[PDB]
């Protein structure tokens, strides 16, 4: 035993959105093993948040997935002490996000460092004027090739009105020590936001993520 049944989640993130700081604190906990978890966010800083919230979930931890008996977890081997990753989401319209986290374990808790930087959002696109509603539930592709573990994943936010808005997101993952790497596989999951407030100062979020040969 040291990823348990039930693991808490403790994290921060700091960062900027067309210019606008904000900070956002969470507590959670989750089913590392069924690849369930749920996460109570708070708007700390920078209320009211003029942007999507949609575009932050994603970066509020792979170790939330069930994996199967003979795909190495890399995420689960890499505690106690855990590991990083850093991912860009490239938007069709010419957004950028990059993002960064920082796991660490502690009991019987993870902890997150989390900097996100957005950039070139339109101040009239479907961002900047909060007309998204949710993520597709897309598979993503997990390989190694080289730097070491990386993830890709074609994303897009559903739009009020019916249409779609895509994301290209790219992951590369670095555990803090050496772990048993595993072969290209896929991750299925679907985020949702269960609940929240008016501007979204109280966010309620849930993945459920499985790892598919």
Not at 44 to 53: I, K, M, N, R, V
Not at 120 to 125: D, L
């Given at each position: 035993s040291v990823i348990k049944p039930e693991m808490k989640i403790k994290l921060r993130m700091e960062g900027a959105v067309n210019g606008h700081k904000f900070v956002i604190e969470g507590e959670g906990i989750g089913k590392p093993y069924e690849g369930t978890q749920t996460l109570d966010l708070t708007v700390?800083?920078?209320?009211?948040?003029?942007?999507?919230?949609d575009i932050l979930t994603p970066a509020?931890?792979?170790?939330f997935t069930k994996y199967p008996?003979?795909?190495?977890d890399y995420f689960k081997q890499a505690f106690p002490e855990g590991y990083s990753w850093e991912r860009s989401m490239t938007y069709e319209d010419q957004g950028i996000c990059i993002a960064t986290s920082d796991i660490t374990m502690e009991g019987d808790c993870f902890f997150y460092e989390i900097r996100f930087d957005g950039t070139?959002?339109?101040?009239?696109?479907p961002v900047m004027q909060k007309k998204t509603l949710k993520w597709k539930s897309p598979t993503g592709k997990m390989y190694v090739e080289d730097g070491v573990l990386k993830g890709d994943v074609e994303m897009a936010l559903l739009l009020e009105g019916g249409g779609h808005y895509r994301c290209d997101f790219k992951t590369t993952y670095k555990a803090k020590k050496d772990v048993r790497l595993p072969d290209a596989h896929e991750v299925d999951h679907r985020i949702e936001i269960l609940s929240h407030d008016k501007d979204y100062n109280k966010v309620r979020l849930y993945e459920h993520a499985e790892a598919r040969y």
């Open positions: 700390e800083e920078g209320a009211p948040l003029p942007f999507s919230y509020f931890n792979r170790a008996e003979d795909i190495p070139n959002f339109p101040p009239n696109g």
